[PDB]
Amino acid sequence: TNQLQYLLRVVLKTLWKHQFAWPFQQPVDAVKLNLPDYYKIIKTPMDMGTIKKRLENNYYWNAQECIQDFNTMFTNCYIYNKPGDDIVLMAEALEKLFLQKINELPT
Numbered sequence: 001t002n003q004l005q006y007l008l009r010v011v012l013k014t015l016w017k018h019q020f021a022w023p024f025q026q027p028v029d030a031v032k033l034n035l036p037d038y039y040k041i042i043k044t045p046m047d048m049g050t051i052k053k054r055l056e057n058n059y060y061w062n063a064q065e066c067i068q069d070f071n072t073m074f075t076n077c078y079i080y081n082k083p084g085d086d087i088v089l090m091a092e093a094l095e096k097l098f099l100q101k102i103n104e105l106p107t
């Protein structure tokens with residue numbers, strides 16, 4: 001019933017497994033991909049890699065701080081990219097699944 005435990009062992013596990021996870025398993029390396037304007041446009045970057053770490057290393061005060069970061073990851077992608085881009089359809093897919101798993105969240 002500890003919610004952070006649930007986010008790690010169940011929510012993050014399911015999303016990490018998913019077909020479309022791989023572009024979100026690590027920070028967007030703006031240099032390698034030649035994105036000069038990314039860290040200017042996106043104020044608080046986020047990826048499942050960093051969320052994973054933060055859950056493992058007892059960083060989050062509570063589950064709501066963690067769920068905020070997941071949402072930042074999605075909105076970040078929807079901000080920087082054009083709608084109907086492939087990257088977006090992938091984040092949208094992940095988000096749907098994320099919100100299903102958050103509804104079975106133990107109280």
Ligand SMILES: CCc1nc(COC)c(-c2cc3c(=O)n(C)cc(-c4cc(C(C)(C)O)ccc4Oc4c(C)cc(F)cc4C)c3o2)[nH]1
Nearest residue numbers: 022023024026027028029033034035077080081085086087
């Ligand atoms: C190369 C210039 C560029 N255009 C875009 C948007 O088009 C999909 C991006 C872009 C945006 C964007 C993004 O928002 N996220 C979260 C992740 C990527 C991305 C990241 C990486 C790595 C693993 C190196 O970090 C690899 C591929 C990424 O995006 C894709 C994807 C997902 C599919 C593609 F066909 C081509 C790219 C560039 C990523 O790439 N970059």
